[PDB]
Paper text:
To further investigate the binding mechanism, mouse TRIM21 was used as a structural surrogate due to its improved protein stability and high sequence similarity to the human counterpart. To understand its mode of binding, we solved the high-resolution crystal structure of the murine TRIM21 PRYSPRY domain in complex with suramin at 1.3 Å resolution. Interestingly, TRIM21 residues located within 5 Å of the suramin binding site are highly conserved between the human and mouse orthologues, even though the suramin binding site is located far from the substrate binding site. The only species-specific difference within this binding site is the substitution of lysine (Lys464) in the mouse protein with threonine in the human protein. Overall, the compound binding induced minimal structural changes, with only slight adjustments of side chains in the surrounding residues compared with the apo structure. A notable exception is the outward movement of the C-terminal region (Cys466 and Pro467) to form a pocket that was completely occupied by a tolyl moiety of suramin.
TRIM21 plays a crucial role in immune defence, acting as an E3 ubiquitin ligase that facilitates the ubiquitination and degradation of target proteins via the proteasome pathway. TRIM21 has a unique position within the TRIM family due to its ability to specifically bind to the Fc region of intracellular antibodies, resulting in the degradation of antibody-coated proteins or of non-enveloped viral particles.
Residue numbers in the entry: 283 to 467
Amino acid sequence: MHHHHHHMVHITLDRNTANSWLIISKDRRQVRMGDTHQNVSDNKERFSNYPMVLGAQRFSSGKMYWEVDVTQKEAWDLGVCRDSVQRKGQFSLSPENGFWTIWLWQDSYEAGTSPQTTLHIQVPPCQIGIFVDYEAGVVSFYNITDHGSLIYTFSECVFAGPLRPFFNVGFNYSGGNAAPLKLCP
């Protein structure tokens, strides 16, 4: 029988896209910033300038929902992006460039609108839910630590083809950002 229900997709990390200093777990569900270049070959899909990686999953219709653990991290970016986004060089995270993201940077949460939007979060998230509804043109972020309170919704999105989960683990020169981003094992 038809029943309104939630469904959480299993996201795994695409090692070929990962910046070469990222350490990805054997099950491809966690990623952290390493202190050495890893034994991985460069290639065209790999993010060169930032500690970024894509989910392997790719979709161009329907609904997708996944959660990410961000505990003990002082910096990260999360969301969804076009399959076709730039991998090499410096770039801003904006819908203009094919990214629908939020981030934490120096104790401030922001949405990656153009220009950036301050997010007034009362309870720092430990887990974040990311929902995409392709046909609706919606990317929504939820604060699992605050009973799933809505953090931000991008609406009227221009997806313009296949999408990928997007992650930035942030740098760890400070020593306060070693913890991984984690997807459900």
